[PDB]
Amino acid sequence: GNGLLYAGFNQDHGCFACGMENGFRVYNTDPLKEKEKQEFLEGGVGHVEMLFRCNYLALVGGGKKPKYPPNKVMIWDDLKKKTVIEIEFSTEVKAVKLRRDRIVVVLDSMIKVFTFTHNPHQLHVFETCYNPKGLCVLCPNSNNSLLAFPGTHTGHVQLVDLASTEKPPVDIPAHEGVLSCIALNLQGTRIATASEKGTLIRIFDTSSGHLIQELRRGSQAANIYCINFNQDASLICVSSDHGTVHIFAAEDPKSKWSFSKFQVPSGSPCICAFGTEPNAVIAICADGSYYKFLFNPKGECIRDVYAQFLEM
Amino acid sequence: GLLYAGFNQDHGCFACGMENGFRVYNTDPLKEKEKQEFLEGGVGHVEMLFRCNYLALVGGGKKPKYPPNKVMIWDDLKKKTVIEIEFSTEVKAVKLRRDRIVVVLDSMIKVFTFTHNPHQLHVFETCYNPKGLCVLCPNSNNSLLAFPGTHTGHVQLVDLASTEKPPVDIPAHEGVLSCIALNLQGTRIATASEKGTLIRIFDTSSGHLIQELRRGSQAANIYCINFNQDASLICVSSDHGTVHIFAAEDPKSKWSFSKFQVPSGSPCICAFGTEPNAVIAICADGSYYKFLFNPKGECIRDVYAQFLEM
Amino acid sequence: MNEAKIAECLQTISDLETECLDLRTKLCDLERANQTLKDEYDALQITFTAL
Amino acid sequence: MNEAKIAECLQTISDLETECLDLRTKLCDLERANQTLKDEYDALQITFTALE
Numbered sequence: 001g002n003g004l005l006y007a008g009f010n011q012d013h014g015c016f017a018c019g020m021e022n023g024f025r026v027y028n029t030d031p032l033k034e035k036e037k038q039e040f041l042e043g044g045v046g047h048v049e050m051l052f053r054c055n056y057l058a059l060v061g062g063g064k065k066p067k068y069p070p071n072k073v074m075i076w077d078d079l080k081k082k083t084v085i086e087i088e089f090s091t092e093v094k095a096v097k098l099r100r101d102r103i104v105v106v107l108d109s110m111i112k113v114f115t116f117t118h119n120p121h122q123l124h125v126f127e128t129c130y131n132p133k134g135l136c137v138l139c140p141n142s143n144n145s146l147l148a149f150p151g152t153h154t155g156h157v158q159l160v161d162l163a164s165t166e167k168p169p170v171d172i173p174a175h176e177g178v179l180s181c182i183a184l185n186l187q188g189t190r191i192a193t194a195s196e197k198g199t200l201i202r203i204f205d206t207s208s209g210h211l212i213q214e215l216r217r218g219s220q221a222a223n224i225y226c227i228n229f230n231q232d233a234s235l236i237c238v239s240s241d242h243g244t245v246h247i248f249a250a251e252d253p254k255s256k257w258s259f260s261k262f263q264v265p266s267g268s269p270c271i272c273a274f275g276t277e278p279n280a281v282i283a284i285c286a287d288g289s290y291y292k293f294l295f296n297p298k299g300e301c302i303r304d305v306y307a308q309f310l311e312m
Numbered sequence: 313g314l315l316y317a318g319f320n321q322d323h324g325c326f327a328c329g330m331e332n333g334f335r336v337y338n339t340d341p342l343k344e345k346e347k348q349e350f351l352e353g354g355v356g357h358v359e360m361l362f363r364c365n366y367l368a369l370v371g372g373g374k375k376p377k378y379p380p381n382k383v384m385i386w387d388d389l390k391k392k393t394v395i396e397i398e399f400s401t402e403v404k405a406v407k408l409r410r411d412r413i414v415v416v417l418d419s420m421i422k423v424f425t426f427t428h429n430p431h432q433l434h435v436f437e438t439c440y441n442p443k444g445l446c447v448l449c450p451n452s453n454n455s456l457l458a459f460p461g462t463h464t465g466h467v468q469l470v471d472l473a474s475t476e477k478p479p480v481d482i483p484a485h486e487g488v489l490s491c492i493a494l495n496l497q498g499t500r501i502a503t504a505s506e507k508g509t510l511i512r513i514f515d516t517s518s519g520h521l522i523q524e525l526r527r528g529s530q531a532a533n534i535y536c537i538n539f540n541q542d543a544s545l546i547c548v549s550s551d552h553g554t555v556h557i558f559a560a561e562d563p564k565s566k567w568s569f570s571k572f573q574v575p576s577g578s579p580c581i582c583a584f585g586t587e588p589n590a591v592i593a594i595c596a597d598g599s600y601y602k603f604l605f606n607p608k609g610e611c612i613r614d615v616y617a618q619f620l621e622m
Numbered sequence: 623m624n625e626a627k628i629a630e631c632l633q634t635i636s637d638l639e640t641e642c643l644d645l646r647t648k649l650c651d652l653e654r655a656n657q658t659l660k661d662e663y664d665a666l667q668i669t670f671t672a673l
Numbered sequence: 674m675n676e677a678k679i680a681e682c683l684q685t686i687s688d689l690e691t692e693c694l695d696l697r698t699k700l701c702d703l704e705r706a707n708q709t710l711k712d713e714y715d716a717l718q719i720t721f722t723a724l725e
């Protein structure tokens with residue numbers, strides 16, 4: 001195909017990184033610009049986690065010919081163009097989440113937290129239910145060390161503060177069914193959740209676990225691919241199968257349904273985030289399509305930008 | 313009103329404490345690098361950490377910005393003080409390395425961690441040290457601290473990485489010390505007494521006398537001593553603004569081969585420029601001079617400026 | 623612009639310097655506590671070897 | 674040129690990143706050793722208090 005194996009936004013959605021069959025690439029989201037491209041003749045990278053706009057990337061090998069064994073996490077130093085820390089595991093790595101002081105690795109059955117040091121030390125292990133999608137969010141903010149992940153019970157989210165791990169975790173019975181997506185706002189004060197039914201998105205307070213807002217995307221089932229907050233957490237964007245994107249208002253009693261939505265014309269699955277304009281939403285699709293949409297108060301969407309980001 | 317002038321560790325810059333703040337300048341070519349204004353008062357000491365964002369400030373002047381018994385670490389990227397250390401006595405000078413703050417008082421030297429709460433590591437007693445004579449090697453692999461001992465005319469040398477070893481004590485002069493200088497490698501220390509007739513260079517590891525050099529037969533107040541990059545030369549300032557230039561490794565040549573007068577005659581500190589035959593003079597009146605010498609020992613004045621005015 | 627690149631880099635440097643100061647501070651603070659607990663281990667060890 | 678100041682800054686950032694990594698390593702190393710000693714203290718403590 002096009003060789004894309006992974007796409008993910010950074011902590012503020014200002015960039016997205018792509019794992020490729022032949023390496024990785026980093027891009028500025030808005031305006032779209034290729035920022036870094038590292039080619040590996042020897043194989044692909046199946047997961048890329050940025051730390052904001054620092055020179056550190058977490059890489060996991062993947063694809064038909066992975067650059068690294070899939071049971072290893074590689075921290076890439078993009079200023080030095082080399083791997084500087086490696087952590088090896090007994091099982092495949094499903095995702096990595098970075099903060100400045102912690103490496104969090106996500107495995108199928110557990111979440112291991114390490115020091116971000118030349119010899120990483122394991123600090124914590126949290127058991128999860130079967131987590132093949134690697135669902136985990138970690139607050140990148142210095143004043144909020146929140147780690148959130150699927151609990152051992154179906155539809156529960158366990159929340160742990162990594163600065164006060166002696167405290168019991170908050171367990172949120174978020175859905176009756178298997179979790180499909182989890183998202184934090186930039187402040188780490190709100191968590192958005194969906195089940196495999198994908199009819200409802202629920203936003204909780206991360207400190208109390210209380211439901212703040214329930215948003216109904218529809219009556220029919222949908223595979224939810226992505227959820228993201230805007231910068232002030234007043235809005236969320238929601239991607240679904242067939243590439244539709246729904247736009248809702250969070251934390252507003254005047255919201256329950258989508259004020260806006262658009263379909264991605266190619267229908268390919270996409271992740272979404274908000275642009276630099278408060279009324280901009282960006283969609284990055286598995287086929288390589290980039291879309292920027294502007295919405296209005298009537299919920300009409302206009303296309304501002306379209307590109308194939310993989311050709312730059 | 314100029315209150316203080318001092319070179320950084322490589323002489324590539326000099327800093328000025330002013331009645332209304334501080335300034336940093338590039339030594340050669342001369343260019344104003346930074347200007348910080350304080351409406352509330354003066355800074356009487358400014359210690360650079362090379363070309364880093366940290367400056368040590370001590371309040372001074374008629375209306376000091378800070379109490380003179382406090383050391384302020386300035387973060388020049390944030391334009392604010394980030395660390396404060398308070399003392400029972402006035403601060404005479406500060407010396408910085410990346411991992412240590414060294415504070416010179418009139419009669420003792422205290423070494424601290426460079427942390428938000430500095431911890432006192434060592435205290436060394438000195439004789440009465442109103443000039444704040446103290447040199448600290450800035451190099452990561454050499455922690456040499458050198459200062460006036462408790463005995464008149466002695467220099468004490470301490471390695472801040474091996475403080476359990478007995479210090480080397482050098483009986484450098486018969487009289488009160490007036491000036492002390494290290495070379496960039498921290499292998500040599502130059503000294504003068506208040507008689508100022510002799511400059512003596514010692515090895516810092518053994519305390520052995522390497523050279524005894526003569527500035528003249530009559531007395532003179534030595535204001536400054538500095539080595540060139542290879543420590544093959546020293547420049548020496550004295551009263552009347554004369555600068556003497558010596559060969560440090562030639563025992564056959566103990567008198568200055570070259571010297572020039574600073575035309576204003578004001579007391580000045582001196583260092584070598586970027587050119588191997590350049591010497592720079594920073595004078596208390598605000599005059600800057602660059603002189604080029606040649607192998608015959610002739611000196612010509614190349615540059616003059618008021619750095620306080622540009 | 624070229625100046626904009628400078629501004630980002632200078633901001634990165636100031637934040638990095640802040641972190642070194644914080645780490646060194648936490649390191650020196652912990653070094654002292656460890657030595658204090660090293661001593662309470664020797665003094666308590668001699669007590670319970672005396673018993 | 675103004676580009677030269679970019680090059681200097683990039684070197685400073687690279688060097689600072691190494692120092693952060695080294696310091697956090699020494700800090701986390703010591704934090705773990707302190708916890709190991711916090712354990713042996715309480716261990717020997719309760720162990721020979723029962724001896725008394």
